[PDB]
Amino acid sequence: SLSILMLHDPEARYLHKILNLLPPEYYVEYPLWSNVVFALANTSANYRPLAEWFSQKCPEKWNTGGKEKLEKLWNDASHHTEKKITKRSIMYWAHKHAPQQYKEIVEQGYFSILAEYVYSYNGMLEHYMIAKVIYAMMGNKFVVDVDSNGKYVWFEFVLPGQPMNQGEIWKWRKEVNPDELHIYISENFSRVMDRITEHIKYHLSQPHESNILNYYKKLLKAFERSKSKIFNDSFKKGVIRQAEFLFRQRSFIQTLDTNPHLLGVGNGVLSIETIPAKLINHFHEHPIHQYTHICYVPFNPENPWTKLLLNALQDIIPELDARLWIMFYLSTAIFRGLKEALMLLWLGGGCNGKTFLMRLVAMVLGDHYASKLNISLLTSCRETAEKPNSAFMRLKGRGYGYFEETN
Amino acid sequence: SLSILMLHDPEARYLHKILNLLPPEYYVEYPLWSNVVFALANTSANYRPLAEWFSQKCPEKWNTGGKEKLEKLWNDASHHTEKKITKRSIMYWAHKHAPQQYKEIVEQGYFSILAEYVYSYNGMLEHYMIAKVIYAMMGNKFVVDVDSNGKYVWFEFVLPGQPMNQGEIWKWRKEVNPDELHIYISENFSRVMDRITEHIKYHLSQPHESNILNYYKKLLKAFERSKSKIFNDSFKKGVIRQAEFLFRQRSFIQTLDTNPHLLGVGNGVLSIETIPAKLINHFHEHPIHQYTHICYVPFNPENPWTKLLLNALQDIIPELDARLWIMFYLSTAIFRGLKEALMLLWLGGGCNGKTFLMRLVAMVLGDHYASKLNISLLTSCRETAEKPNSAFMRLKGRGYGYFEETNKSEVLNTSRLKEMVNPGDVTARELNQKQESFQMTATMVAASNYNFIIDTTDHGTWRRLRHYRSKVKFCHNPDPSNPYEKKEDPRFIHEYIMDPDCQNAFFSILVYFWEKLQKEYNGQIKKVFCPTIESETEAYRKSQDTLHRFITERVVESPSAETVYNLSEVVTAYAEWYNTNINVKRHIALELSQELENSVLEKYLQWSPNKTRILKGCRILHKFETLQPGICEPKNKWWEWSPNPS
DNA sequence: TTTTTTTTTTTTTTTTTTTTTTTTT
DNA sequence: AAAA
Ligand SMILES: Nc1ncnc2c1ncn2[C@@H]1O[C@H](COP(=O)(O)OP(=O)(O)O)[C@@H](O)[C@H]1O
Ligand SMILES: Nc1ncnc2c1ncn2[C@@H]1O[C@H](COP(=O)(O)OP(=O)(O)O)[C@@H](O)[C@H]1O
Ligand SMILES: [Mg+2]
Ligand SMILES: [Mg+2]
């Protein structure tokens, strides 16, 4: 089926090209090879021969190992709900381990796409073809989804070295209008246009029969006329309007920030899924949007501020067991999943110190995850007046809530 | 009348060609040709000649099977409808078994249409022609209708193997903008363009006189100029706007989800029209849009989760008859049509599982079919004047409404209660919009640990209520002395609900119970006797009646004395009594005066000549004032319903 | 029982048009 | 080079 694999599907040939220049030691290693097999399986269920061939390269694993076990693993990956990793991630490892050679590969790929369109339609460019060529590149950024209000929304993935606000690195951000997309389509696409022009000029230079007398002249004239369209504002608006259909991704907005084991931190995200916690400061695929402006560092008791805070905590409440219990309960606010349903309330004097800690926790967790409520919520008459309340929007996605003092 | 078929458009011959692919054994199968003739009946009435020809389509046993058989199903009543399979499905039947020829037939059909247009108009394509070609090449995937305020909304039929949300398979979904339509018209229409270009070039290749020297060249130039227009944005928007009219289907939005016998599940649509319940995971035509994310599987008691749920349910309620009645009542939540006017309320104390149970039903049945209702609706103290009340909504199409524990025992006046149980229509208005009327068909349950204060005596009110009292409590120290005590489980509520398998098992149990009830006495709830139920209800009705308690406490057993003026002092004594004996509340004296006649004081209630209805005589008690002168337990399985007595 | 729902807006142009250089004369 |  290998000939069938490179017979019908264009991105099947593209994936076949990408599968080279790979570190086959990772294929030998069970964990990473299983991860990439799962990622490939999540990319459609018609890639069974492709996955078999990927298991066929370096045949030592397919000859010395669980061949039936691997087939069953691929099958259950096909018919189960779990991670849906995609080659995107793979593209990231390919760039990380094998630079240089991939650049010319992808460049020649989208150059071939554009040249095929130009030859097919006599150099008469139009919104859809440039939109498709643009979608051939990027993919890293500019994911489009429909909001609850029915308006298309653009989400841009932030990378280091860009003009961004504090804490927006390594996570998506909401964009009212894709400014970077306009800048890119106006600037970098000119390079591909110049490449096409040089290609057609070179073919014009070589001598042939009367075809070069008129056909290439007409093609060059048409392409020169169509080149200036990419700088027109209305043309760019139409291209963006057509491209938002391709970038549209189903089930993205409602699947945003749903994972309770990932927290948007000022240096990226935190992986509290497994012990110990990991900080992710590189490319990933987790749909994280909300964040806090507090950088994360490993817990070092030798730090002077950590020592001061620990001494203050010891001074606030003397009981060791009570201190440990209350600290354990307060640390639960970092989680965002279902928790044990218990309420803590503690009283004291005007200098009890209760307010200060609650305030420090709220400030550390940030506004997105922490919220302050009103004591009147517990002590109020029933809403027989039908007037809607103003506080139940709180706790939606929040991991912590506190009540203030009252005379 | 074959010449009539010849003259009546090429679409008749197109249908001829597509139906020629039906095998003779398909025509032999009685239901197959029955539903096919019904489908052609739904599409106009001029297809009688086509049906007559179909009588001779593979007629190897038409004479054996009866000449006047196929025409009988149509000639008996050409009019009248049964909501059956129309067209839009014969193509699916042809494609499900006869590929290759079907696809080439449809390909040559729309190719002929487009070639006719391009030849007629000298290769100058426009919006309407492309829209018609697109509609012809897929009329089985999109529907357009107009909603209330007035817009054009696009619905598309989801099929396996394409990006989608979870659980929206085999059913329509609402699209603000037909994205896949744009993708198709930009991608797959280029194939037809290439085919037409190749045909034109092939015709140009063959030599002839001047009629092809420039005529083909001119039209070829025009067509290659117009080819690039399909990739335009404004042109595509215009084509979509034009095609909005072709895909128009009258009476589609208001018929959405109107059938109460169809349920949208995670893996398709569930039909409960016939016994047993049928799951559809293929092409169909039922207009459903709402759904739930609970996959449906047949009721298998061997499943470990089903066993665990059954054991827990048996432990929660000990009585077999009461358990069966409760499950039968809860099984009606699946139905969404008109139901019998029954209100269920059952009390308890501490750990009872009532609320926990309500939660399982709510999550299993889904958000679009189940709702949470505030107790303020049934408080009945508030009289909603001309003002919005959104709490009265969330009953449209819902088949289940449940309540929760309250602060303390509360009064429930018959107002805002009589219309909440009856199978009638109610009206209310909310933010924006205006007043509207809607049929309510949701089964209602309300449980509490504090008794509901019911103040009424009419048989009409005390006929749509059922009261139960749970007898099993949960405590962390289950002393092995009384059976009505068991250990708890925090994960019994913290988890066992998030796991989808539990929802699947509970849905299977609910479907099985509904099927069992339907196989019983044609539905309904009044029959199937449960001696515990309605007996607890009449015992409750004996209590919760202050007037009878007042009479039996003060005047009954002291009839010999005579201290009576009129209804006035009786009213005052009852008022101070109920004010002290019970809570304080305001009343109108006419209701008490009328009910006093209906009370058990008729033996002393005689109207005096000057009216005043003076009681013949009793003793109003003050101070202490004493000395006044006057089942089978099932063996191993209980879900099997036991025999008829059960 | 005000209060916020209702009221106030909301997109308002964009599309286009023009031409379109080249092609025909 | 002027008009479609
Ligand atoms: N660990 C500490 N050591 C010394 N002073 C403290 C400490 N914690 C709080 N304080 C001071 O004591 C005061 C009481 O804090 P606060 O939380 O307002 O008391 P309460 O919670 O009773 O209102 C604060 O003004 C703060 O500056
Ligand atoms: N079959 C069972 N197995 C284990 N624990 C149960 C069972 N039934 C009830 N429980 C305990 O009782 C609770 C059930 O809900 P409960 O709180 O009793 O509802 P209600 O609000 O009616 O009291 C659970 O938290 C659980 O700990
Ligand atoms: Mg304080
Ligand atoms: Mg409960």
Is there contact between A176 and strand C, defined as CB under 7 Å from any strand atom? no
CA A356 to centroid of ligand 1, rounded, Å: 6
Chain A closest CA to B355's CA: distance in Å?
16
Q: Three-state secondary structure along B37-88?
A: HHHHHHCCCCCHHHHHHHHCCCCCCHHHHCCCCCCHHHHCCCCCCCCCCCCC
Distance of C1' in D4 from CA in B123, Å: 19
d(CA B210, CA B213): 5
d(CA A113, CA A121): 12
Three-state SS at B511: helix
CB atoms within 10 A of CB B634: 15
Q: Which of B152, B176, B183, B231 to mutate to test the interface with A (most CBs of A within 10 A)?
A: B231
Q: List protein-proximal bases of chain C (any atom < 7 A from a CB).
A: 1-7, 14-16, 21-23
CA distances from A138 to A95, A101, B232 (A): 14, 18, 22
d(CA B263, CA B273): 11
Nearest neighbour of A251 by CB, restricted to B165, B382, B384: B165
Tokens 């692919």, residue? B21
Q: Which residues contact B148 (CB under 8 A, 6 or more apart)?
A: none
A vs B, Cβ pairs < 8 A, gives: 55
d(CA B528, CA B644): 8
Q: What is the bridge-based pairing of β-strands A143-146 and A152-157? A: antiparallel
CB atoms within 10 A of CB B346: 20
Alpha helices in B520-614 (DSSP H): 535-542, 546-550, 567-581, 589-598
Phi, psi of A289 (to 5 degrees): -120, -50
Is there contact between B234 and strand C, defined as CB under 7 Å from any strand atom? yes
3-state helix, strand, coil in chain B (%, to 5): 40, 10, 50
d(CA B514, CA B228): 59
The CB of B353 under 6 Å from ligand 2? The reply is yes
Residue B344 backbone class (left: φ over 0; alpha: ψ -120 to 50; beta: rest): beta
Q: Which residues contact A240 (CB under 8 A, 6 or more apart)?
A: A131, A178, A181, A182
The CB of B489 under 6 Å from ligand 2? The reply is yes
**Tokens describing residue A305:** 């501020």
Is there contact between B588 and strand C, defined as CB under 7 Å from any strand atom? no
CA atoms within 13 Å, Cβ hemisphere of B257 = 16
**Tokens describing residue A235:** 């043309």
Q: What is the bridge-based pairing of β-strands B400-402 and B370-372? A: parallel
Nearest neighbour of B186 by CB, restricted to A128, A248, A250: A128
Tokens 């010849």, residue? B6
d(CA A160, CA A140): 14
Nearest neighbour of A126 by CB, restricted to B179, B232, B376: B232
Residue A57 backbone class (left: φ over 0; alpha: ψ -120 to 50; beta: rest): beta
Three-state SS at B192: helix
Choose which residue among B356, B448, B495, B502 to substitute to test ligand 2 binding: the one with the highest number of ligand atoms within 8 A of its C-beta.
B356
Q: Which of residues 400-459 of B touch strand C (CB under 7 A)?
A: 430-432
Identify whether the C-beta of residue B33 lies closer than 8 Å to the C-beta of residue B74: no
d(CA B631, CA B75): 58
What residues form DSSP beta bridges with B155? B143, B174
CB atoms within 10 A of CB B288: 20
Three-state SS at A190: helix
Technique used: cryo-EM
Q: Three-state secondary structure along B437-500?
A: EEECCCEEECCECCCCECCCCCCCHHHCEEEEECCCEECCCCCCCCCCEECCCCHHHHCCCCCH
- Residues of chain B that touch chain A, judged by Cβ-Cβ distance less than 8 Å: 163-166, 176, 179, 182-183, 186, 224, 227-229, 231-234, 236, 376, 379, 381-382, 384, 387-391, 490, 494, 498
Eight-class DSSP state of B426: E
B59-87: burial string, b at 16+ Cβ within 10 Å, e else: eeeeeeeeeeebbeebeeeeeeeeeebbb
Residues of A in contact with B387 (CB under 8 A): 386
B584-600: burial string, b at 16+ Cβ within 10 Å, e else: eeeeeeeebeeebeeee
Dihedral angle sign, alpha carbons of residues B101, B106, B110, B116? positive
Radius of gyration for the alpha carbons in chain A, expressed in angstroms and rounded: 28
CA B634 to centroid of ligand 3, rounded, Å: 63
Residues A382, B389: C-beta atoms closer than 8 Å: no
d(CA A289, CA B413): 50
Eight-class DSSP state of B551: I
Residues of A in contact with B384 (CB under 8 A): 386
CB atoms within 10 A of CB A297: 9
d(CA A291, CA A266): 7
Q: What's the distance, CA B120 to chain centroid?
A: 51
Tokens 């409590």, residue? B473
Q: Any idea of the CA torsion for A69, A70, A71, A74, to the nearest 10 degrees?
A: 120
Residues A245, B165: C-beta atoms closer than 8 Å: no
Q: Which residues contact B400 (CB under 8 A, 6 or more apart)?
A: B333, B361, B362, B365, B369, B370, B371, B442, B443
CA distances from B481 to B84, B110, B139, B470, B477 (A): 61, 81, 71, 18, 11
Instruction: Identify which ligand lies nearest to the alpha carbon of B346.
Output: 2
d(CA B222, CA B124): 7
Nearest of A248, A11, A156 to residue B162 by alpha carbon: A248
CA distances from A121 to A124, A215, A223, A231, B223 (A): 6, 13, 11, 21, 11
Three-state SS at B224: helix
Chain A closest CA to B160's CA: distance in Å?
11
**Tokens describing residue B446:** 């309300």
Q: Which of residues 220-279 of A touch strand C (CB under 7 A)?
A: 221, 225, 234, 237-238
Radius of gyration for the alpha carbons in chain B, expressed in angstroms and rounded: 35
Identify whether the C-beta of residue A27 lies closer than 8 Å to the C-beta of residue A58: yes
Is there contact between A386 and strand C, defined as CB under 7 Å from any strand atom? yes
